[PDB]
Structure 1
Amino acid sequence: EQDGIGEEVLKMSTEEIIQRTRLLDSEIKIMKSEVLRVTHELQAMKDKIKENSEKIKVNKTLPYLVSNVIELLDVKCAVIKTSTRQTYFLPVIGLVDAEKLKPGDLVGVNKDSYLILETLPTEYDSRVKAMEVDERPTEQYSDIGGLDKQIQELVEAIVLPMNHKEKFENLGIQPP
């Protein structure tokens, strides 16, 4: 703040109403020239990204096909094996990237273009599905008589690794 006052004290009619006019005139005329320019460029690009997101949506049909990703190359390039025992290959994958996939995925495939566009959350055999038992009823520990030491030694073994995740990391050990 001292440099703005000291240029008002020494000189009076050299750069008071000159320096504080010529660079402030040049600033606002650039700012007036760019406040409509960046805005008009903003609005036109919002239209072009709308027309494309419209055009991606119209070509987006619903009926898809499942397949299996075999590999991935770059000279980007991915090998598709469909569910009709048919193998395919593309130069470019599609709407999903190359670095978010892996071999063994059940991607949604266009029936004509054979384009990868969907993820399809990849279920498996029904046997471990039958092994999934949720909704465990809360059994009060006092139902157990006489075995309360083993209860604690279990709760010391598992529940505190579940709760105090960072107490076991700064100490220097690993929970069993």
Structure 2
Amino acid sequence: TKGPDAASKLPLVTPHTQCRLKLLKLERIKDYLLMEEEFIRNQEQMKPEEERSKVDDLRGTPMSVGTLEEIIDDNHAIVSTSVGSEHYVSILSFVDKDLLEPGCSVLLNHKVHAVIGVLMDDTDPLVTVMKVEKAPQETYADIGGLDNQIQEIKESVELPLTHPEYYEEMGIKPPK
């Protein structure tokens, strides 16, 4: 459970009448943003090895990604190449014999196929674009009326996350 990767919404500037209260609030957001950029950039510059470097030498470049299918011994597993073939590759020490699970997408050495790393987070590009990063900009105050419809849609998707006590204290399972 990586946790909720909620959208990234910059705070909201209201007044909207284009008054100086608006300019100041946008400036404050900009000021911290300029400050925040400063830390990111000034962290790479202000910021000026012998263990991992050995590992990267065993792996080499590139590293194939096939699907694990069986952990024969502790140091042997059968990995299916990216074409649907099979291979009785060797499980090296640096790999974690724990995260290695049947069905997991394993990183394979290119010359002599041998499990070298477990590639979690291999979700398709076709579903990793399905995730909303930049939150839309229409707050519940932009929707007029629909108070009966909104409440119905706020008791299944918002409330069951803020005040879970109400539902579990009553025996319901939040409408889903």
* 2:169 is aligned with 1:173: no
Structure 1 unmatched runs, 5+? 1-49
Which protein is richer in helix relative to its size?
1
- Output the aligned Cα RMSD: 3.4
Q: Percent identity?
A: 34
Structure 1 position 66 matched with structure 2 position 71: no
What are structure 2's unaligned runs of at least 5 residues? Answer: 1-48
Q: Which residue of 1 aligns with 2:124?
A: 124
* Gap change, CA 1:71 and 1:160, over 3 Å in 2: same
Higher RCO (CA < 8 A, seq sep 6+): 2
Spell out, residue by residue over 1:116-158, the C-alpha distance to the aligned partner (whole angstroms, 9 max, x if none). Answer: 22233324263x4565454342324344344212212322332
Q: What is the distance in 1 between the residues matched to 2:123 and 2:139? A: 35
1:96 aligns with 2:125: no
Aligned length: 126
- Does residue 79 (structure 1) correspond to residue 91 (structure 2)? The answer is no
TM-score by length of 2: 0.53
Structure of greater Rg: 1
Amino acid in structure 1 at the alignment position of 2:110: K
Q: 1:170 to 1:99 in 2, by over 3 A?
A: farther
TM-score, normalised by the number of residues in structure 1: 0.53
Q: Which residue of 2 aligns with 1:158?
A: 157
Quickly say closer, same or farther: Cα 1:137–1:59, change in 2 above 3 A: closer
Question: Structure 2 vs 1, CA of residues 88 and 123 (structure 1 numbering), >3 Å: closer, same or farther?
Answer: same
Task: Give distance in 2, aligned partners of 1:77 and 1:166.
Answer: 49
Question: Contact (CA 8 Å) 2:65, 2:105: kept in 1 or not?
Answer: yes
Please tell me whether the aligned partners of residues 72 and 78 of structure 1 are also in contact (alpha carbons under 8 angstroms): yes
Shift of 1:94: 4.2
**CA-to-aligned-CA distance 1:3-38 (integer Å, 9 cap, x gap):** xxxxxxxxxxxxxxxxxxxxxxxxxxxxxxxxxxxx
Aligned to 2:46: none
- 2:87 counterpart SS class: strand
Distance between the aligned counterparts of 2:146 and 2:53, measured in 1? 66
Give distance in 2, aligned partners of 1:133 and 1:55.
39
Alpha carbons of structure 1 residues 102 and 76: separation in structure 2 relative to 1, 3 Å: same
